[model samples]
Target: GSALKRINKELSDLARDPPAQCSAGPVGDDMFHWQATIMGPNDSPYQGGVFFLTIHFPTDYPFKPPKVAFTTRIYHPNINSNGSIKLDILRSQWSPALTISKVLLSICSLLCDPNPDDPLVPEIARIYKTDRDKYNRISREWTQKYAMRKESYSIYVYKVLKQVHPDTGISSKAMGIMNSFVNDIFERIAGEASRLAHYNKRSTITSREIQTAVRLLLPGELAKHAVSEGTKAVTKYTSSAKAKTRSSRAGLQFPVGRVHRLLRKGNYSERVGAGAPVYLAAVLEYLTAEILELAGNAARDNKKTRIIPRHLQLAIRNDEELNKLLGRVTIA
Candidate 1:
C-alpha cells in the first residue's frame, strides 16, 4: 500500500515537469514498471545517442532500490554486454531521498564519467584503460548503429511561414517559439501512433493505430462532438484532389493583400489588423493540409483508389483539434 502511494507521488511529480535530457513513464498500464529514455551527454562518445532503460520498482518501497536494466545496448564500461548497469545507488548507495529524476541524472553522469576501476563489463573497462582511441571509436560505432533514428517532428516552421507572408508578419523571435512547439506537438501525436502499433504487436503502423491513439488521448464529449464534425470535414476534403486543394488553401489564387482588402470591405476593415486576414488564411491553409492528409490515409486504409466524402469524414472524425474546428464549420 505504501509502495503504491510512493509510486503515485513520484508519477505526479514527474508528470508536473520532467528533467531535461531525461523522460520516464509507466509502460502501458503498469505503474510499478517504467520505460525511460536518456540522451547522451555532450562531448561524450555516446553523444547524439538516445538510450532506453527499464525500471521495476520494488514493492517494499524506498527501503529497497528499484531493479533497473538497459533495454538499448550501448558500449560502456559501467554497462554489461546484456545491458545491465553497475551503479552505486542501486545497491549500497540506496536512499529514500533519491528519485527517478535523480537516478536518471546519475546515469547520465555515469555516461559522462565511466568508473573503469569497478566495471560491469571487464573487457570494455580494459579497453577504456588501455586504448582510448579504440574505445571512443567502438562507442561511437555502437551509438550510430543502435541509437541514431529520425525523430518525429513538424515539417512547417516560422522561417517558411514568414517568407510566405513577410512584413506585418510573424516576427523571427516568435518563429523560434512557434517552431519548437509545433514540432513537439506533431511529434507527440506521431509518437502515440507508433506506441499503439507497438502495443498491438504490429510491425507496421496504420490509420487505425493513429485513430486509436487519438481516441485514447482525447476524452469525453470533446472527442465525441469533435469526431462528428471531423466526419463532415473528411467528407468535404475527399471529394476530388483539385477541389480538396482549393478548399484547403482558401483564396490561394488571390494575393494575401487581396484577401486582406476583401476582409476590410466596408467598416469591417477598421477593426481588423492588416496582418490578421493573412495570418488567418495561412492558418487555414495548414489546417486544410492536415485534414486532407488524414482523409487520404483513411481512403488508403479502406482500400479505395480515390478518396470519397465518407473517407474524409472518417479521417477528421478521429482527430481532436481538427474535429473541433472543422465540426464548427457549415460543410456545404
Candidate 2:
C-alpha cells in the first residue's frame, strides 16, 4: 500500500508542481492508470488548451516509462489525434535522469515542436518536416475546435461511434470513444486526397494506390489486399529497375561492392576537378559519400550483407546537407 501511496504522492506532487510543461496525477482512484494535463507551448497550437492522457504504469514504475497516450482530441504533428502521445520519453529517449515532473514538461513542450524524424505517425512526421507552420496552425485549429474547455469531444464521439462498423473496419459498434478525433483525420485525408492533398504522401506512391483505386474498387479486406498488391507491384517495378541498373550500368550487382566503391570514390577523392554545373556534381559527390556512411552505419547496425537503395534514401533524408543537395534538383 505504501508503495502505491508513494507513487500516488509522486503523481500528486507533479500535478501540483508540474514541470514547466506538464501537470500529471492519478485519475480517480486508479493509481495504476494515471492521467496528465499538459499545456501547449506559449507560441504553439497547444498554447491555451490543456491536453490530457491516460498513463498506464507497469508494476515496476520509474525504471520504465508509463504507457502514456492522449485522452484529448487534439490535432498534432506527432500524434494521430486519437490521443496517442508521441513522446520520446516513452521511446528510446527515455533516461534515468528523468522524473515524472520532467516527463510532463516534455509532453507540454512536445505539443509545440514534434520530432518528425522519429514519428509514431509517419505522415505527421513527414508533413511536420516538410512544413512545420502548417502543422502548428492545424493543431491550433483542433485545440480551438475540440478542446474548447467549454465543450468536450465526448459528446461528439458519443454520436459518431454508433456508426462505426468494426466488422467492416468502419467500427459501427463505436470507436471505443475517440472517433470524433480519429474520424477527423479520415475526413481530412479524404478531402486532402483531392489534389495538393497527395503532396503529404510518400512522393513515390507505389503504383498500387493508383492502380488499385482504378481496378476492382476494393474495400475493407479487399482494399487492404489491393494495397498489398499495390505495394507488391511497386516492389516488383522497383526491383526490375534496380536489376536493370545494377546489371547494365556499372554491373555492380553485388550491391555492397557498389556501396563501398561509391562511398570511396566520393569520400576518398581529393577533387582533381574538370566539370561544368560545378554546383550539382559536387553535391551529388557529397551525397554519394553520405550514402556510403549510411550504408556502413546500417550494415553495422543490422549486420547486413549489403546496403539497399532504401538505406541510401534513409541516409540521404537524415543528412541536412544531403537533403539540401537533393532539393536543389539541378544535378545533385
Q: How many backbone clashes does candidate 2 have?
A: 11
How many clashes in each candidate? 4, 11
Off by over 4 Å in 2: 1-6, 95-97, 149-332
Q: How close to the true structure is residue 299 of candidate 2, measured as C-alpha lDDT?
A: 47
True lDDT of residue 326, candidate 2: 37
Task: Give the runs in model 1 whose Cα sits over 4 Å from its true position.
Answer: 149-332
TM-scores, one per candidate: 0.47, 0.41
State how far residue 61 of model 2 sits from its true place (Å).
1.3
Poorest lDDT segment (10 consecutive residues) of candidate 1: 263-272
- Write down the RMSD of all candidates, one decimal each: 16.3, 25.0
Give the clash total for candidate 1.
4
Candidate 1 local lDDT, 276-302, one digit each (tens): 333333433344345545655666677
TM-score of 1: 0.47
lDDT by candidate, in order shown: 0.59, 0.46
